C-alpha cells in the first residue's frame with residue numbers, strides 16, 4: 147500500500163507502532179528516501195483529543211529550528227478525518243533498545259544523556275513540561291537520541307497490551323498533589339532513565355504492588371540505593387536528580403554544567 151501527503155507519494159514498508167487511534171509506518175518516498183509517517187484517525191476524536199494533536203503538531207513545528215535533538219517533522223496533512231505527519235525515521239526507540247542490551251557503554255550512556263538534557267531543556271524553554279518522560283519518548287537516530295513527543299497527546303508502543311503503563315518514572319510531587327508540576331518533575335523522570343541505564347533497574351521497580359510503589363516514591367524514609375560505581379560524577383548526577391523535594395532537586399541548566407556531561 148501507499149499514501150499521499152501534500153501531493154507526495156510514499157510507499158509503506160511496514161508498521162512500526164500503534165497507540166489509540168494512531169499508527170506509525172516506515173515509508174519510502176519516490177527517491178527511495180526513508181521516512182516515518184504518523185497516521186492519526188480523527189473519525190472518533192473528541193474536541194479535547196483534537197486540540198491535543200493540534201498542540202503537539204504546533205510545538206513540533208515550532209521547535210524544529212531550536213534544537214536538532216527534537217525529531218524532524220518535514221511535512222504534514224491535516225483534515226477533519228485524519229492527520230498525516232512525515233517525520234525522520236529512527237532505528238529504534240530507547241525502551242526497546244534498553245530491553246535488548248545486556249550492558250551499556252559508558253560513553254554511549256553519557257552521549258545519550260547529553261541528548262536527553264538538550265531535548266528536554268529546549269521544550270522547557272518554550273514553557274512545556276513533558277511530565278510523562280520514559281525511555282519510549284526517545285528515539286535513536288544514527289547514534290543520537292531525539293525526543294519524539296511532548297507528552298501533550300497519545301503515546302505509542304512498537305508492533306501488545308493497550309493496558310500497559312508504568313509509574314516507575316513518576317515524580318513524588320505529581321503523587322503528593324492528589325500545581326506541583328514544574329521542569330523539576332522532568333528532572334526526576336530523566337534521573338530514573340539514567341538510573342535504569344546505570345543499575346539496570348528503575349529506583350522503585352522491586353516494588354510489585356502499584357499502591358506500595360507510589361507510597362515508596364513519596365516516602366522520605368524510603369532511601370533510594372545508589373551502589374558505588376567507577377564514575378563518581380555519574381553517581382552524584384543520580385543523587386541530585388532523585389531528591390524528593392523539587393526545590394532541592396537539580397535543574398537541567400545546572401545538569402548541563404555538570405562534570406558528568408562536560409568532562410570525559
Ligand SMILES: COc1ccc(Nc2cc3c(-c4cnn(C)c4)cccc3cn2)c(OC)c1
Pocket residue numbers: 162163164170172182184233234235236237238239242282285294302303304305
Ligand atoms: C521497536 O522498533 C522500532 C522503534 C522505532 C522505530 N523508528 C521510529 C519510530 C517512531 C515513532 C514511534 C513508534 N513507536 N514508538 C515507541 C515510537 C513515532 C514517531 C516517529 C518515529 C520514527 N521512527 C523503528 O523504525 C524501524 C522501529
